[PDB]
């Protein structure tokens, strides 16, 4: 019960290039489709999440998303940078405000929900690793 042999198909790659082969000789062509993919290689080469301050990670990611024309991601990183601002002196009210459920944690939960609906795995795991690296 062998099926009818196929003549065309596709094979995706990690950079969004769709390698499609065709029959009538045989032709293999590649078409770029990186605009349909939310996760981008260019942001991973410029994101930093360990070798800076907790505010520094989010500000660097905001600058990276700003220079790559991603407004929502840049604003999310900017807001997280504002929420992760510390200083040399230690006051307890910053820690009390950080540990509150309605600040930081609420933002991360709602951002995870929003980027789950947007199918953005890169931003999901980047939010997770920034919020875990800020924990110290």
């Amino acid at each position: 019960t062998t099926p009818v042999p196929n003549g065309c198909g596709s094979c995706w790659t990690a950079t969004g290039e769709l390698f499609c082969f065709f029959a009538n000789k045989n032709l293999v062509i590649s078409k770029n489709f990186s605009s349909l993919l939310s996760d981008r290689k260019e942001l991973a080469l410029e994101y930093l999440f360990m070798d800076a301050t907790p505010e520094g990670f989010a500000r660097n990611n905001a600058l990276v998303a700003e220079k790559f024309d991603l407004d929502e991601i840049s604003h999310c990183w900017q807001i997280l940078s504002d929420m992760l601002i510390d200083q040399s002196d230690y006051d307890p009210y910053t820690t009390i405000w950080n540990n509150h459920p309605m600040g930081i944690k609420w933002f991360i939960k709602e951002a995870i929900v929003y980027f789950e609906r947007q199918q953005n795995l890169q931003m999901l795991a980047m939010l997770c690793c920034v919020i875990l690296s800020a924990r110290r």
Partner: protein, 286 residues
């Protein structure tokens, strides 16, 4: 990257490697050809000839296990090719089925070097390639009249499942049972009026586990699952019907974009909306 007349007669698969740097094109000419696709250059490398019949599918292994390429053909022999010191060579032979082997696909690299060998006699076999002491391939009768496709489920964490598309209007999900030491049936999915051609699992699981089953009745069903053990939501991809027979389904590597392959030599791209309506997102023809 444009390749013209790679094979003399027909073409069946062209699978990129893990890094997107090597392309393995197989055809009905009993030949497998490896191309270096760095940049736009598509310089040929080798002209592998081992099969006595038309070659259907190939699948690169993980670089964790090296430069290993599997192959399946009409003669029922699964040939496995390894490139050592720039010399491509056949290593092991897996000829266990009495009919044409239809689908070949490597397991996710967390499971070890396991090969999903599915044949047209309704029998599937999962075989492990470790060292010289090869393992006995576990054989279970997946379908009654024939199996044309079989694809793995991704290991999102550090049980093993794979989808199996039959030729008897059915899609079957299999789960590994440690007590029985084999794969037992998990769920049975019926949404097609013809032979299920390609079944494809989504490599990314964000809130849902996607599938993409195509068949010869010119339709596409996207079977989704919310929980880890739950019912499958059958939904269409088009309100109308496709112009010709649908052959292939290949998910995008990140972001649920589906690349269908109809019989009209036309690749249709589909991306879901925020509501859940599968709007088209592109088209590649010739």
């Amino acid at each position: 990257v444009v390749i013209a007349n790679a094979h003399n007669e027909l073409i069946h698969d062209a699978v990129l490697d893990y890094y997107g740097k090597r392309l393995a094109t197989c055809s009905s000419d009993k030949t497998i050809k490896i191309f270096e696709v760095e940049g736009e250059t598509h310089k040929l490398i080798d002209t592998l000839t081992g099969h006595e019949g038309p070659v259907w599918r190939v699948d690169w292994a993980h670089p964790k296990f090296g430069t290993i390429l599997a192959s399946c053909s009409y003669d029922g022999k699964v040939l496995i090719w390894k490139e050592e010191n720039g010399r491509w060579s056949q290593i092991a032979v897996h000829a266990v089925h009495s009919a044409s082997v239809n689908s070949v696909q490597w397991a996710p690299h967390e499971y070890g070097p396991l090969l999903l060998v599915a044949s047209s006699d309704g029998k599937v076999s999962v075989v492990e390639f470790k060292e010289n002491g090869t393992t006995s391939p576990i054989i279970i009768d997946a379908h009654a009249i024939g199996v044309n496709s079989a694809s793995w489920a991704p290991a999102t964490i550090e049980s093993r499942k794979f989808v199996t598309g039959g030729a008897d209007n059915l899609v079957k999900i299999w789960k590994y049972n440690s007590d029985a030491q084999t794969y037992v049936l998990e769920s049975t999915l019926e949404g097609h009026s013809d032979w299920v051609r390609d079944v494809a699992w989504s490599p990314t699981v964000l809130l849902r586990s996607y599938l993409a089953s195509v068949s010869q009745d010119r339709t596409c069903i996207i079977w989704t699952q919310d929980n880890e053990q739950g019912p499958w939501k059958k939904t269409l991809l088009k309100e109308e019907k496709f112009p010709d027979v649908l052959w292939r389904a290949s998910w995008s590597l990140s972001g649920n974009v589906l690349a269908l392959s109809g019989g009209d030599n036309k690749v249709t791209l589909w991306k879901e909306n925020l509501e859940g309506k599968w709007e088209p997102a592109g088209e590649v023809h010739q």
